[PDB]
Structure formats: C-alpha cells, structure tokens
From a paper:
α-Helical coiled coils are ubiquitous protein domains, found in a wide range of structural and functional contexts. They consist of at least two α-helices, wound into superhelical bundles and held together by a mostly hydrophobic core. β-Layers are found, also repetitively, in natural coiled coils, where they form regular fibers with alternating α- and β-structure, a protein fold that has not been described so far.
One motif is [name] from Actinobacillus OMP100. The first three and last three residues of the insert are in heptad register with the flanking [name] adaptors and therefore constitute positions a, b, c and e, f, g.
Numbering used by the authors:
A (entry chain B), B (entry chain C): 0 to 69
C (entry chain A): 0 to 67
Amino acid sequence: HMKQLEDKVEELLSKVYHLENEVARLKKLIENKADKADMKQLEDKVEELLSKVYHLENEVARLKKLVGER
Amino acid sequence: HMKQLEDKVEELLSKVYHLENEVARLKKLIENKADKADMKQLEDKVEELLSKVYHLENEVARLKKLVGER
Amino acid sequence: HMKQLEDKVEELLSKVYHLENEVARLKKLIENKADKADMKQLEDKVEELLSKVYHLENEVARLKKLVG
C-alpha cells in the first residue's frame, strides 16, 4: 500500500525531472530567438535606405530625361 | 492518513499532466519565432547596402551638379 | 517509512510548483520575440532594397557615361 503509493510518486518525480531538463533546453532556445525590438530597428534602417533609394531613383530619372533633350 | 496522501498525489498527477501539455504548447510557440542567426544574416546584407547607398548618393549629387538646369 | 513517503511527496509538491512558475515565465518571455512570418517580410524588404540598388547602380553608370 505504502510501497504502491511511493511507486506512483516516484513515477511522477521521474516525469518532473524529465520536464525540468526539457524546460532548461527550451529556455536556451528562447535566448537564441530574435527580439521584436531588434527586428523593428533593422526594419527601420531598411525603410530609411528604401526611402533614400526612392528619391535617388526619381533624381536619376529626372536627369536622364534632361540629358536626353540635349 | 494514507487516503489524504493519495488525494495529494491525485492532485499532483493532474498537475504533472497539465505541465506536460503546457511544455508541448511552449515548444510549438517557440518554433514560430525567428532565430537571431536569421536576423544577423539580414543585418550583414544591410551593412553591404548601407555603403552602396552612400556611394550612390555621392555619385548622383555629382551628376545633378554637372547637369545643372535646362 | 511514513516520513520518507511524506518527504517524497514534499519533493514532488515543490518541484511541480517551481516548474509551473518557470514555464509561465518562459511563456511571457516568448511574447517579446519576433515571429518567423515577420522576419520573412523583412527578408523580402531587404530583397527589394538590394534589387533596387543594383538596378540604380546600373542606371547611374549609364547616365554618368552620357553626361561625361
């Protein structure tokens, strides 16, 4: 009876140890995931560069038209 | 006495089962997040592009000046 | 024998509580991380940028020749 009850507790304890170790592995995975704030900062840079290129494209198109008349 | 300890283990049985399911869910949530390595790959390319845009800016300003008005 | 069984249950009781808290903590941490769908969108924007840069370099080289 007490031997049977301690068998169940031991089975549960074994599961918990396994789960503890798995969660430690997952904690490490999470540390290696990219933060939203960092992605946003890179996105802002890309958008800054895309706007610079946009205005450059317009100017080059303008200049191309002007020189094509001369 | 033993009945009350069984009732405690019955409670813990359920908690361990729920924990197993929560950890499975956490593992799925983790898989939907991007790795830092993926972000750094993009960052490396943006670094290349930053220099190219700088050079383009200088070249286009030089050309705008040369061309002048109509 | 009865004290040993009670201590085994105490061990389980404590570890379950501790692991519940840790899993909840990690759940919260996850919410601050970037989704793969969003990184893929950024990857496509970076593609957009690199293509436009190459195209513009070529346009500028041609214009530069024409002006010079």
